Design an enzyme around this catalytic site. Sequence first.
Site: not given
Length: 309
Positions: A19, A43, A48, A77, A110, A204-206, A251, A253, A260
Amino acid sequence: ARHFVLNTGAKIPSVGLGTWQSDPGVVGDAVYTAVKAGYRHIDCAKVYGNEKEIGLALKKLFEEGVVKREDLFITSKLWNDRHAPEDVPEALNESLTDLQLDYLDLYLIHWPFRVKKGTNTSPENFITPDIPATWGAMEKCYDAGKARAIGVSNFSSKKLGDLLAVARVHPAVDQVECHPGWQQTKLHNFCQSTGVHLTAYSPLGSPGTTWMNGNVLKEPVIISIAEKLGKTPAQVALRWNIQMGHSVLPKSTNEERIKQNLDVYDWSIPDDLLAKFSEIKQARLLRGNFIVNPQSVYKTHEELWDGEL
Ligand SMILES: NC(=O)C1=CN([C@@H]2O[C@H](COP(=O)(O)OP(=O)(O)OC[C@H]3O[C@@H](n4cnc5c(N)ncnc54)[C@H](OP(=O)(O)O)[C@@H]3O)[C@@H](O)[C@H]2O)C=CC1
Ligand SMILES: [Co+2]
């Protein structure tokens, strides 16, 4: 294989919704869509800011009877300005209040980095961490039932071991960056030797974080295994982590990709394709530049990660 077991005996769902970088209103609908899609793991982090939003999505899920509270694994965190022992439980109560929960399933330090309470990350605000004293206060939150488990994030092998050596309650989790481009072999081995679970963030390697420069999902090794197995690169990336015994926090949206990212359970990466991950170049994507500084206890990136660069 939809869960991993923590050293407290509690099961952590292998897939959780990341998130970080989920904006006004965007994260609430993502929590809601992911949980009805089947996510049992969310998470969060106080830094955030979106915990209130997340709390309202969880309250809506409970009211509609999609899940009960005990069905869900909720993590948040402790941010770097609440490391002082008497500030820790107050920071947890705030995160709890905002999420409208009575307990977290997991509460993480954190970063191994401290700043004065209520100040931002800038050199005059740096305080030398005292992780044992912060952990002592984390342990009392655990004893009081406020956190079912406690753990850490962004802790190297050295730093995790240093904490294990002084702790009474062992950290349940070390949540760190881990993906085909940063496979964390050293820390992975060390976690298995100690009973600590490893949760992969940026699995995903962001790809959507500008300044990280992530192209993990375009590696030829992943794209090939993806074609040979009929899956997306993202699915093969997440499956690699799961097959290593790591939970993963994709993460997202987009509802299609949220679902998936859950289809990583009932299929395997063969041994002969799995060995090809050794051929993927390795680069840490989240270097922690914001706490490496001539005035920080970490003067080099090497000092922050203890050579795990
Ligand atoms: N210090 C710490 O403890 C940290 C913890 N974290 C945690 O870990 C989580 C995950 O890391 P994060 O940096 O968000 O990066 P991820 O590796 O989860 O990737 C995020 C990006 O990938 C895209 N994406 C999602 N699903 C797919 C798919 N199936 N195919 C292709 N692209 C996809 C997302 O866009 P879209 O939304 O459009 O799908 C988003 O831009 C965070 O949300 C946070 O909770 C993160 C960083 C630091
Ligand atoms: Co011990």
